């Protein structure tokens, strides 16, 4: 298991333009287009982020370079933030991919907002942070990710991905 396994599993990988668990207009590995409910302005974000004319549908190999960008990119809005550096610098490789998944997710501003529960994975707290994290509306809306993502952070072992 790594990160892009790991984000597979919770992403999924649809090639057709479809809504995320939010409703929002998205495209293959949990690529988010837009949060406009115009479908037309998801094309048009679509058609700029492959750089072709695509009417709402992508290759494999068109996914998976999004998906690159975007595993790259929560990478690099950890490193930038200045709350998410201090934690995802002190974690071991298998809970920083947690935190990559969490940024994936909900972004590098829903993440650093969780300050209560960084403060408990700087200080290795891991049951009590994992505790703290599910007292959230990303764990109540995507519970069973959550619980993934969490078992991810209190174990750090892939346990909850096994099998899967
Ligand atoms: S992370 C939230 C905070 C805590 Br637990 C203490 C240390 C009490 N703070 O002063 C805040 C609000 C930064």
């Not at 990478?75 to 935190?99: C, F, H, M, Q």
Request: hydrophobic letters at 40%.
């Amino acid at each position: 298991m790594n990160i892009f396994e790991m984000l597979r599993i919770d992403e999924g990988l649809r090639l057709k333009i479809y809504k995320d668990t939010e409703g929002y207009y998205t495209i293959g590995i949990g690529h988010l287009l837009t949060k406009s409910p115009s479908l037309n302005a998801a094309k048009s974000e679509l058609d700029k982020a492959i750089g072709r004319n695509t009417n709402g549908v992508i290759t494999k190999d068109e996914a998976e370079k999004l998906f690159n960008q975007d595993v790259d990119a929560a990478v690099r809005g950890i490193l930038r933030n200045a709350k998410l550096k201090p934690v995802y610098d002190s974690l071991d490789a298998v809970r920083r991919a947690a935190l990559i998944n969490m940024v994936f997710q909900m972004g590098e501003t829903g993440v650093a907002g969780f300050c209560n529960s960084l403060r408990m994975l700087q200080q290795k707290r891991w049951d009590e942070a994992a505790v703290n994290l599910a007292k959230s509306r990303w764990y109540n809306q995507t519970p069973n990710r959550a619980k993934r993502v969490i078992t991810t952070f209190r174990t750090g072992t892939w346990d909850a991905y096994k099998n899967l």
